[PDB]
Amino acid sequence: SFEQMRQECLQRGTLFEDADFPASNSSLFYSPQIPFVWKRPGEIVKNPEFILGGATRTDICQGELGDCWLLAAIASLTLNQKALARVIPQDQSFGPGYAGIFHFQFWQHSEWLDVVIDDRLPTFRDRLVFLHSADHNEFWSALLEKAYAKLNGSYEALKGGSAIEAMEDFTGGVAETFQTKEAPENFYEILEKALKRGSLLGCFIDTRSAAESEARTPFGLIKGHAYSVTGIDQVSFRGQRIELIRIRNPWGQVEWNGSWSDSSPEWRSVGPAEQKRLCHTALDDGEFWMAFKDFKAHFDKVEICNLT
């Protein structure tokens, strides 16, 4: 129990050390390093605060693990302060009662799992190397990420993750899933409404075996790799109405190289405005358009995660 471990440590005058997820290299990687040392918040700042001026979007600043798609889920959690209070119990602080131990709750399949941690964090020049607040006295987000890394087995296990999967872990909800090649007749409008509503949308290509995991296709797509759906629209192309979809690769910047890709002749073909209407520019940002018909042929699954 968390309350019991805190009580034990407190009555013994010591700070908690998590034997299940210790302050060592195995908790960070399965291969690696850059000069870091593990420190508790009270040893890097003088008055460490757990939650400072609210738990909000300004407290979520990427560290050396990256601008993960997982960050988008934590961002959306702060917009649901009721859900945030389930993931992050408010019985906790660096004040009287502190004993170097925190806990977080993640929905797993039919249960909220309590995940317990010690507050030792990877550190550089007395400063957090991974997730951190813009307020360097504030530690909830740093600690949330450590707890999620633990559920997942390591910090390294976090890169490449789905924001959808994390949002499921954070709320107890379930994303709806659709098969692109067996999709409803109004699939376009369904996706359009979900986007307008503020839902998280993801798309994937199925692997037929472990062999296919992170396999790149000749069209510049990657199998068993999480992507995000960010736009859907229509254009006039050579006198026809073409449905388009906008996809973001959130882990690296490999892009689609077929029709409607960044440098493709479709973009040159289409009316002068319409290129600006759809806000298109050719950049190696991991983001791109495809024809919605090519989308359905090349991707296998869509996941829609409605935020209430």
Burial of 231 by CB count in 10 Å (0-12 exposed, 13-18 middle, 19+ buried)? middle
Annotated binding residue 135 = no
User: Can residue 61 be called a binding residue for Ca ion (CB under 5 A)?
Assistant: no
Residue 267 beta carbon to Ca ion: minimum distance, rounded to whole angstroms: 11
52 part of the interface to Ca ion, by CB under 5 A: yes
Nearer to Ca ion among residue 33 and residue 47 (C-beta): 47
| E strand map for the chain | 37-39, 101-107, 112-118, 121-123, 176-179, 200-204, 227-237, 240-248, 287-291, 301-305
Q: Which stretch binds Ca ion (CB under 5 A): 9-17, 243-251, 257-265, 294-302?
A: 257-265
Least separation in angstroms between residue 278's CB and Ca ion is 13
Amino acid at 112: W
Q: Which stretch binds Ca ion (CB under 5 A): 34-42, 90-98, 181-189, 258-266?
A: 258-266
Cα of first residue to Cα of last residue in the chain, in angstroms, is 31
Residue in the block written with tokens 């882990």: 251
d(CA 185, CA 235): 20
Q: Exactly one of 18, 59, 118, 145 binds Ca ion (CB under 5 A); which one?
A: 59
Closest of 258, 274, 250, 288 to residue 62, by C-alpha: 250
Contact flags string 189-218 toward Ca ion, x per CB under 5 A: ------------------------------
Interface with Ca ion (CB under 5 A), residue total: 8
281, with CB counted inside 10 A (0-12, 13-18, 19+), is: exposed
Distance of closest approach, residue 261 Cβ to Ca ion, in angstroms: 8
Q: What is the chain's Cα-based Rg?
A: 22
Please tell me the distance from the alpha carbon of residue 191 to that of residue 238, in angstroms, as a whole number: 25
Q: What is the 3-state secondary structure (H, E, C) of 196-236?
A: HHCCEEEEECCCCCHHHCCCECCCCCECCCCEEEEEEEEEE
Question: Which residues between 277 and 296 bind Ca ion (CB under 5 A)?
Answer: 283, 285, 287-288
Q: Is 258 annotated as a binding residue?
A: no
Residue 107's CB is within 10 A of a number of other CB atoms, namely 17
Q: Which is nearer to Ca ion, 287 or 303 (CB)?
A: 287
The three-state secondary structure class of 141 is: helix
Is residue 67 a known part of a binding site?
A: no
- In whole angstroms, the minimum distance from the beta carbon of 249 to Ca ion comes to 9
Active site residue 225: yes
Residue from 165, 243, 262, 300 touching Ca ion (CB under 5 A): that is 262
Q: Which position among 68, 132, 203, 305 bears the catalytic label?
A: 68
Q: Is residue 75 part of the contact set for Ca ion (CB under 5 A)?
A: no
Binding-site sequence positions: 52, 54, 59, 138, 255, 262, 283, 285, 287
Binding-site sequence positions for Ca(2+): 52, 54, 59, 138, 255, 262, 283, 285, 287
Contact residues toward Ca ion (CB under 5 A) are 52-53, 59, 262, 283, 285, 287-288
User: Could you give the residue numbers annotated as active site?
Assistant: 68, 225, 249
